[PDB]
Amino acid sequence: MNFLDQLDLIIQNKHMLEHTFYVKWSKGELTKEQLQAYAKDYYLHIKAFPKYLSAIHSRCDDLEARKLLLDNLMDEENGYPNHIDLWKQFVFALGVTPEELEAHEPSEAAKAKVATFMRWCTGDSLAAGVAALYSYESQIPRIAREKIRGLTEYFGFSNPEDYAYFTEHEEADVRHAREEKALIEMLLKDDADKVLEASQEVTQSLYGFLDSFL
Amino acid sequence: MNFLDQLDLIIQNKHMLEHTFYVKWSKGELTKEQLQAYAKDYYLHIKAFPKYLSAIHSRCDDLEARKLLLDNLMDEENGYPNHIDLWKQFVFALGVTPEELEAHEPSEAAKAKVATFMRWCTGDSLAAGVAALYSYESQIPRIAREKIRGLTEYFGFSNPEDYAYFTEHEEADVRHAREEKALIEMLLKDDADKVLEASQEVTQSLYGFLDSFL
Numbered sequence: 343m344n345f346l347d348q349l350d351l352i353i354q355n356k357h358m359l360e361h362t363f364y365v366k367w368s369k370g371e372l373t374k375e376q377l378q379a380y381a382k383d384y385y386l387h388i389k390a391f392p393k394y395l396s397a398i399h400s401r402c403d404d405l406e407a408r409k410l411l412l413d414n415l416m417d418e419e420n421g422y423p424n425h426i427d428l429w430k431q432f433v434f435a436l437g438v439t440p441e442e443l444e445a446h447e448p449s450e451a452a453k454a455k456v457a458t459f460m461r462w463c464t465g466d467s468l469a470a471g472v473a474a475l476y477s478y479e480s481q482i483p484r485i486a487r488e489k490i491r492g493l494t495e496y497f498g499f500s501n502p503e504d505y506a507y508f509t510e511h512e513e514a515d516v517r518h519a520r521e522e523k524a525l526i527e528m529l530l531k532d533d534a535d536k537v538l539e540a541s542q543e544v545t546q547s548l549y550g551f552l553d554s555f556l
Numbered sequence: 557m558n559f560l561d562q563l564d565l566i567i568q569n570k571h572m573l574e575h576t577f578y579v580k581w582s583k584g585e586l587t588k589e590q591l592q593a594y595a596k597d598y599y600l601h602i603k604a605f606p607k608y609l610s611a612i613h614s615r616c617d618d619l620e621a622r623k624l625l626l627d628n629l630m631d632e633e634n635g636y637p638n639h640i641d642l643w644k645q646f647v648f649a650l651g652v653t654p655e656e657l658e659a660h661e662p663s664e665a666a667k668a669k670v671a672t673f674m675r676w677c678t679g680d681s682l683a684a685g686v687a688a689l690y691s692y693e694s695q696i697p698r699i700a701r702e703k704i705r706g707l708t709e710y711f712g713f714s715n716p717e718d719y720a721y722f723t724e725h726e727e728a729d730v731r732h733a734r735e736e737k738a739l740i741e742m743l744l745k746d747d748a749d750k751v752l753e754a755s756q757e758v759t760q761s762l763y764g765f766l767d768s769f770l
């Protein structure tokens with residue numbers, strides 16, 4: 343079996359949309375107290391995602407790979423509103439005040455998720471770092487689509503600008519996962535084992551993060 | 557004394573334009589054999605400069621600082637022709653063939669320069685990493701200006717597109733040094749000592765690199 347296929351199968355078999363939290367989201371069975379906690383607890387990962395990308399770029403000598411990593415990073419962090427600003431719009435539309443979000447101390451659940459990504463993105467296998475990111479970003483497009491639906495037919499999201507982060511990631515992360523899948527191939531150095539090891543680790547780590555809100 | 561002033565004084569007092577190699581350039585007293593060797597030996601630093609920036613960014617939690625680091629990185633590596641492509645144009649206009657440049661193995665002089673930057677950019681002081689980069693980029697604008705002159709009135713540079721790298725850096729690195737000087741302030745964490753330690757180290761390291769061609 344080809345390792346990219348093995349890679350996708352791992353994510354297919356531990357995919358956040360099958361997690362209770364997002365199933366609960368799908369049927370609507372989630373409190374406003376639970377959403378505001380997740381929106382706040384996600385913020386640490388959202389601020390850190392640029393560093394995941396620059397961590398790999400900064401250890402990379404493939405000049406064409408770096409430009410691809412830069413393209414993701416540029417979409418993440420460049421301009422107003424970058425993806426960080428978009429999340430904030432979602433966090434504030436949920437009801438959270440700016441002060442409360444900035445004063446929020448992230449759960450150790452969330453710190454473990456981030457730390458799992460950073461471990462791979464700073465590790466010794468550039469393809470494993472991209473696989474860590476890929477095992478998340480490739481789920482994102484379908485997650486966003488179903489998350490807009492749940493914000494509409496369940497949580498009173500009238501204004502579209504209130505879930506713009508998810509509208510952007512419905513499309514942005516189709517490109518990103520395609521570029522990451524290509525980056526994994528161009529950076530492979532007889533380490534497809536770490537690619538899958540990273541995939542297993544990130545996907546489970548994401549389950550523990552979702553577990554935290556129950 | 558203020559440490560940014562101390563910082564500039566260090567660079568003023570070990571500035572590449574005062575080095576024999578660039579004085580020799582200034583009077584024209586440099587062989588085509590010497591320029592093609594320097595153009596080739598510089599290539600390792602030129603390919604690595606993006607990683608210097610992403611190395612600091614990837615360790616940084618100041619969200620406004622990261623966007624500044626990204627702006628430099630974007631000017632360095634984004635688009636055709638990025639700064640790497642521009643150097644190539646200079647390397648090829650000097651007479652070097654593409655194959656010979658890609659087949660060139662960099663001197664240990666050059667490997668020491670790069671390694672000095674990367675040590676600081678991956679070290680434990682974000683302001684020292686920016687100071688390592690600043691102690692180089694702040695010299696660049698005046699270096700470029702005098703290096704265009706020496707390519708014109710000495711080395712037969714007719715076509716302007718042949719020294720476009722230096723035309724770009726005459727202006728680009730005015731902005732970059734101003735943004736880096738500002739980044740050093742925003743990232744200082746009671747470590748102005750490392751800022752100057754880095755400055756001393758980078759500036760000397762640059763002298764040893766220039767020393768290599770004599």
Ligand SMILES: [Fe+2]
Pocket residue numbers: 418425511514
């Ligand atoms: Fe994103």
Ligand SMILES: [Fe+2]
Pocket residue numbers: 479514515518
């Ligand atoms: Fe993304």
Ligand SMILES: [Fe+2]
Pocket residue numbers: 632639725728
């Ligand atoms: Fe540059």
Ligand SMILES: [Fe+2]
Pocket residue numbers: 693728729732
């Ligand atoms: Fe620059």
